[PDB]
Amino acid sequence: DSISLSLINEGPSYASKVSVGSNKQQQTVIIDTGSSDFWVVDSNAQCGKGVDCKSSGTFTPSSSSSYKNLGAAFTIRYGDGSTSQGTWGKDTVTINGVSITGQQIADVTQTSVDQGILGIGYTSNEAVYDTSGRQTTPNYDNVPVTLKKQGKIRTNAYSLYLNSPSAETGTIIFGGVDNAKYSGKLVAEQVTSSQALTISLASVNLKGSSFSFGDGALLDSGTTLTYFPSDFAAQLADKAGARLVQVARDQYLYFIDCNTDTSGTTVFNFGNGAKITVPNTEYVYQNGDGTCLWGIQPSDDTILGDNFLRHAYLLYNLDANTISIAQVKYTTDSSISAV
């Protein structure tokens, strides 16, 4: 028993159709290995200024006969400062025809995000606090845990196939792995955090030279680009020809010439012999105005986002605390086995 769910390549994010409630209200929501809560845009939400938060489906709790309020406030703040607020509830969630009952979700009534987010990370990373760090609700069973508990999948595990940069769709498989979609062997890597789906990144080879790393990297479907500690990003930037630009007061981004040579590749070395190679076009992000962001940016959190993950097949196993990785093979052939 596995559940395949199509991933829509939206550009900066990958989303899936998820139905919520007794009346199967279709939400198109970001699939996010970097967060752990599922929240939906209330039909009466007050989007942030300038934010079109209702064009990817909305949820009306009152037309779902099964919706229950939990009577606790929900607040989340993501790494880029994006926020959502609402209240916690429970309802039926349906993923490609498979329904789980009584799933805890948040009904969001204010958000700066364009659409809801289905966080599928560790329950230990749930956003159960207010903005001051005071807890408002207990940790709880998020979607992957409930899929296992209700007998829909055997293991809290999922495989991520974002597919190629030009692909319109990819696939996430809950409780299964598609052995047709990678070359070599899947290499199981130990997860290096109990809260974040991070594995040890030994080194990065950029423009032919190795740069020693040795620390954890978050394998985040919900991040567009790649983020490294400032000093390391700066060493890579100097090699790549990227420039840190203060785009507004105390706001910095790496830009790179849009005409930069992208013929090469950037190579990521992980444990146990695993290597993922990324084409260098993934590091020139067109802004659409003749300028380009570099695909690496500085952060106090190390993140390998979509520009990396498109080039790997990943089996995340939250019960075994391993993420198995291999160089992706783009194919519509499938050989899906349960995990």
Added chain:
Amino acid sequence: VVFAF
């Protein structure tokens, strides 16, 4: 975008 820490 950068989705929770």
